[PDB]
Amino acid sequence: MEMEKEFEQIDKSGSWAAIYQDIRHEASDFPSRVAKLPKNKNRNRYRDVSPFDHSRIKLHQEDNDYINASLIKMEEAQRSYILTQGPLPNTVGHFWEMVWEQKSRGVVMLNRVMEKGSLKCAQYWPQKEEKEMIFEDTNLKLTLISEDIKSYYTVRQLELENLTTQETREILHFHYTTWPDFGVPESPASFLNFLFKVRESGSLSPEHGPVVVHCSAGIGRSGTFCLADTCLLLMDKRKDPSSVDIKKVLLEMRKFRMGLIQTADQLRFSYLAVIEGAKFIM
């Protein structure tokens, strides 16, 4: 079926939970043996969210190459994304090592450091120009260059230096700051505006390594971001935009990381975002 009218048909019939459970039943199951090794317990935020072995990002280290991060490679859309958990106190250096080694231009952050009164990720970037951060375990230096605070999101320019070679690179930090503590946003308008700002920066384009996107677990809000981007791109590429099937695209993405889209409300919100976004594109 088309999307907008499949949408109204699920609303009128109140069957979002049943649609979402079908997705959960059909989703791929692949091994995640490296994630579950005992030496990696303090590298995982949640025991039930792990990268598959076949698609995990490897650190360029011989001691321990493990990080909770996955490469989502979308062949028809010609887009790639790295989806990862919010960094932990003992993985902030690994996180920036990955950004460096994978040649990413941008980092997309969809959560606040504290939500619901609890810490959802480490304070992994500097808040003042004159107070830079050094990660001694991976030999990197990170400096805040500029910051632009808007009503729904903040953009930061950061400098990442590989202290071993003295090479430097400019990284863009795109921080969506207004996702509610409970539920999903009422309108997709600010989320779409944010996606378009990431696109306009070049961070999603083939001349760079994959964008790094995270929330707390790296599967819920993060899944919504890449699912909406890929669906909208396919609607631009194909002769028949109504052929784009958001449930099929989501199942394709779940071949590369488990659990993408965590609730039926996130699924409904993804439909809403793609539907509204397709009208603005034209």
Q: Which residues are annotated as a binding site?
A: 181, 215-221, 262
Q: How far is CA 47 from CA 34, 35, 42, 59, in A?
A: 13, 9, 10, 21
Taking alpha carbons only, the member of 133, 138, 105, 116 closest to residue 216 is 116
Tell me how far, at minimum, the Cβ of 208 lies from ligand JH4, in Å: 12
Tell me how far, at minimum, the Cβ of 205 lies from ligand JH4, in Å: 7
Tell me how far, at minimum, the Cβ of 207 lies from ligand JH4, in Å: 10
Residue 195 has, within 13 A of its CA and on its CB side, a CA count of 25
Per CB under 6 A, residues contacting ligand JH4 are 77-78, 206, 233, 237
Residues annotated in a binding site for substrate? 181, 215-221, 262
Cβ-closest position to ligand JH4 = 78
The nearer residue to ligand JH4, 71 or 235, going by C-beta atoms, is: 235
Catalytically annotated residue among 121, 215, 226, 231:
215
226 counts as catalytic: no
Q: CA-CA distance, 115 to 150, in Å (whole number)?
A: 20
Q: How far is CA 272 from CA 69, 123, 191, 247, in A?
A: 27, 32, 11, 13
Tell me how far, at minimum, the Cβ of 277 lies from ligand JH4, in Å: 16
The nearer residue to ligand JH4, 97 or 229, going by C-beta atoms, is: 229
Rg of the chain's alpha carbons, rounded to an integer? 19
Type of residue found at 206: P
The nearer residue to ligand JH4, 77 or 213, going by C-beta atoms, is: 77
Strands across the sheet with 56-58, in order?
56-58, 66-74, 79-84, 211-214, 106-109, 167-176, 153-162, 140-149, 133-135
The nearer residue to ligand JH4, 77 or 99, going by C-beta atoms, is: 77
| Residue appearing with tokens 């793609």 | 274
The nearer residue to ligand JH4, 60 or 103, going by C-beta atoms, is: 103
262, two tokens: 């965590």
Tell me how far, at minimum, the Cβ of 227 lies from ligand JH4, in Å: 16
Q: Catalytic amino acids?
A: 215
